[PDB]
Amino acid sequence: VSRTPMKVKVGPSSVWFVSLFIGLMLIGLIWLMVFQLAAIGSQAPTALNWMAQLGPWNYAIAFAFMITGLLLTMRWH
């Protein structure tokens, strides 16, 4: 469909692309955290550690907002 001046289809159109993009991101968040929370890592002058019992809170909320805010932008469009 179109909200203006932008029209987006993979079709039946706007809902279906956006819904797929929303899922693919949410899945990427969960995986990236899961491996990260196992992970402790250093390469060159950069070093990164994540450790958990369970609750992947900081990155997942921030990225989920960022994608959802893009979704609100894509649908305003």
Q: Is 62 in the site for a second copy (CB under 8 A)?
A: yes
Q: Is 48 in the site for a second copy (CB under 8 A)?
A: yes
Residue among 19, 23, 28 nearest 74 (CA)? 19
Q: Tell me how far apart the alpha carbons of residues 42 and 23 are, in angstroms, rounded to a whole number.
A: 30
Q: Tell me how far apart the alpha carbons of residues 54 and 34 are, in angstroms, rounded to a whole number.
A: 10
Window 18 to 37, contacts with a second copy (CB under 8 A): 21, 24, 28, 32, 36-37
**Sites of contact with a second copy (CB under 8 A):** 2, 5-11, 17, 21, 24, 28, 32, 36-37, 41, 43-59, 62-63, 66, 70, 77
